[PDB]
Ligand binder design. Structure first.
Ligand code: 5LD
Ligand code: 5LD
Ligand code: 5LD
Ligand code: 5LD
Ligand code: 5LD
Ligand code: 5LD
Ligand code: MN
Ligand code: MN
Ligand code: MN
Ligand code: MN
Ligand code: MN
Ligand code: MN
Ligand code: MN
Ligand code: MN
Ligand code: MN
Ligand code: MN
Ligand code: MN
Ligand code: MN
Lengths: 176, 176, 176, 176, 176, 176
């Protein structure tokens, strides 16, 4: 899937053997973690003007790509609790068709390239593109890289669960 | 436009002279204010199980109806500052394709039938159905009815502006 | 229009080329600002015993004069945000037939002749004579003259909007 | 199973396709969520005098019905973390034969029909009827309906796990 | 118009279709937003030593170019309230011939390339080159890019209003 | 496997049906819980001088024995949330080859034989022998025995998950 604006040009191809090359080494690493714990190969390429636009538009495109790949009847709910050294991060997803993100982190030891702004904009992008409810809740930790990487690992693991096929439409209201 | 779940059954028809009859007298009043200040006739009918499901699903259906009704090129931005006796409420809308709501109110004198829960759920529904950014920011006020009605009046006025036809795609990124 | 008591004798004639001469140089200046931003010539003359009675009775007479000049179907709502150097003042008017004034200012650097008492009594007079809801909300500023003059400039601009002719009775209740 | 007092008359039949009709529309909705996420059809009918007696006695009767339905050797432990928009609620169950409930919620935006009293009394009833340890721990959230519905969804999911057949008596002390 | 010092060399040509290329990608994006919402084509090119000198001198030069472009009699006042996701920013301009800037923002989630220092210096440069009073007041928000971009969008929209032709000298003192 | 120092002499044999007999009745009970929820038979015998050296060295030896027992490719991650009456304890494990323990508990009602010192030293021993990251985070609770026992139950359950065979090396860096 390709999404192109005047700001960014992004390809996300889920289930395809390929490199993740966004021209942002931090995001390449985070997306590698996400794909690995999701349990899917993917090819991702991007060009961009500003890193915010990249992280957001990657979130949106990835979310749309996951939505396109979603079985007609899907599990809907998935969670992960991801430790990474000092970090302990809860990730909870509901593929609800109600875009919402709540990212609650507390970075004590900052690291160049890792920013809460960028994390939040990726997650809101993902929530909007997938049309999902996403909570990221830090339970412990100080290190920026461990916290953010735990969040991406957790997103991958939670979405592994939530995107599996189900026998039914997973809502009491009869529609998702 | 009709939206039907096991919880609610809603029809919203913009531009048709008709009744607003939701079987919730508070919501009927608030929607009447909204339609009046938007400057458009509309017919709205609904059945529901619980009031929260009604307020939310009315927001969603109304938002989708407004989105369907938009000119290809639209003004995108609209604001209103709405006084109502003690209440003074700022409503700011960006038809951004990025669902978001922030409803920041402070009700001192409560009134039966008016609930922040219901206002928030309508606004989030509208933000999700229209695919828009919506801020409701109370500047002054105490009375629940004045605050909530000012918000609905302000939403009508802000959307009156934001849904008008434009000569261009109103985004520097070239797409909405 | 003339209003005469044992305390004051006031003439306000809107749409007439003339001087504003109240025998209070501060009020003459504030009224000049008001008329200029309203976009109307006016003639105003007054005699008075005490400045409070002047500012109040000018408010009342001006409000009655605006009410007499109001089209049968009028726009009802008008706002202004007026910067003046350090001052930034929001003025929001609803010609509601529900007299109410809320003047929320915070003068740090006082100036002879400018008093919150006098401002409040003018505004309450205006609200009572016009039969309107009036909010003045200081958003920024320290200087008494800039804050009060911004309020009068803003009143003029807000009433310019609110006193324009409309195609309809601007109330969902069918009466104003 | 039928439980009858001078206050309430309740039938709960697990595994029968049937209606959930308690004459309380909120509880009907919450029980529908519970049964849906438990993954079991059930028929529930009730009459009652006061809502508290209904919520409590429904908990008791449902708990007894679940206890009667358990395989001799059961999994005992089950958890769910349930997001619902702003709400994020942890539900942790141990079918311990030691009745206990701790419901730790924080409702900011109240909603008519939803009460912490009623939630607590249902959960304590369920803990006493099933003979179980039940924690409901709010991690995030403001909305009453989202919080309470997340708790019922989470209870269904947690009990789905805890009520599954096991190869052994799940206790180091050799008895449950 | 061209402005050259030992620090910077800047060309701003309002009304010419052309590139905005300052050798600062963040400023290019912000000026693109500014020009788009002002509603005028412009060509802007720059070289510079240090980003602060660029942002400031661009503000000065753009301000001078706008001043040169004004009709003899101009509207003087303009406002915008600009939402951008979480951000909600008020921009209020008075082309007063009294240089003044007050930039009141609160960035919670910082982003590389975006700095309050640079925003303030651009706005002070603009106020000084145009000879204007400029308030930027954040009402809501956390994200640096959303806040700063909302300010530039808002400046564009406010100056669109303020730079229009008027029938009169817009001052009670008879000169601007 | 056997580990002998001048302080302790410990045998841990995973997969062998046998006694857990450490000459510390509290540790015997905790290890019984651990083994039961891990789902593996084991024989553990020990002699010791001081209880701290026992708890630590048991942790080390058990960790080494688990490490020796791992398949070449293992699941790596495992979590448990364990209620025990008032206690609710999160246990999160990553068999990371990066020894780390964070035991975050809050015992209100102390009990003879149970000490935070001993729990921490067991967990650090285990993290160091297995070469793993281990978080024990109390979410609720007062009673020492319930809290500590929930931690051991949870460690068993979490390691049941983490020690299973995987089809791949579970790390984006390609080595563990
Ligand atoms: O989570 P869902 O949509 O499956 C069912 C809910 O009952 C719908 N809802 C949304 N807000 C309150 N209720
Ligand atoms: O508001 P838009 O989408 O027209 C242009 C913005 O540049 C896009 N954006 C979204 N977050 C940061 N920038
Ligand atoms: O503002 P109005 O009078 O047009 C209509 C309102 O519904 C009347 N009202 C006055 N208080 C509460 N409602
Ligand atoms: O949780 P159980 O009943 O399987 C075993 C526990 O050892 C019993 N216990 C209850 N309080 C303290 N210990
Ligand atoms: O805003 P202006 O210059 O049009 C007229 C003001 O009265 C001048 N002024 C400046 N400070 C106080 N008053
Ligand atoms: O958790 P791992 O070792 O599988 C991969 C991580 O990227 C390595 N890392 C360790 N600290 C920061 N990153
Ligand atoms: Mn963004
Ligand atoms: Mn890493
Ligand atoms: Mn809802
Ligand atoms: Mn009303
Ligand atoms: Mn008085
Ligand atoms: Mn003056
Ligand atoms: Mn009771
Ligand atoms: Mn519901
Ligand atoms: Mn400078
Ligand atoms: Mn941008
Ligand atoms: Mn030690
Ligand atoms: Mn015990």
């Amino acid at each position: 899937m390709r999404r192109t604006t005047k700001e960014t040009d992004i390809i996300v191809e889920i289930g395809k053997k390929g490199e993740i090359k966004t021209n942002d080494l931090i995001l390449d690493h985070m997306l590698t973690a996400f794909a690995f714990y999701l349990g899917k190969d993917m090819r991702i390429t991007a060009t961009y003007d500003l890193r915010h636009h990249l992280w957001e538009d990657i979130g949106i495109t990835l979310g749309e790509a996951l939505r396109e790949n979603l079985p007609e009847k899907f599990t809907r709910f998935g969670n992960a609790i991801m430790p990474m050294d000092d970090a302990l991060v809860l990730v909870s997803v509901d593929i609800s068709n109600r875009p919402y993100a709540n990212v609650d982190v507390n970075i004590k030891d900052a690291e160049e390239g890792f920013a809460v702004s960028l994390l939040k904009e990726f997650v809101w992008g993902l929530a909007r593109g997938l049309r999902a409810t996403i909570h990221i809740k830090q339970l412990s930790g100080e290190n920026a890289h461990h916290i953010v990487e735990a969040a991406f690992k957790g997103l991958g693991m939670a979405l592994r669960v939530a995107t599996k096929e189900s026998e039914r439409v997973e809502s009491t209201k009869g529609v998702l």
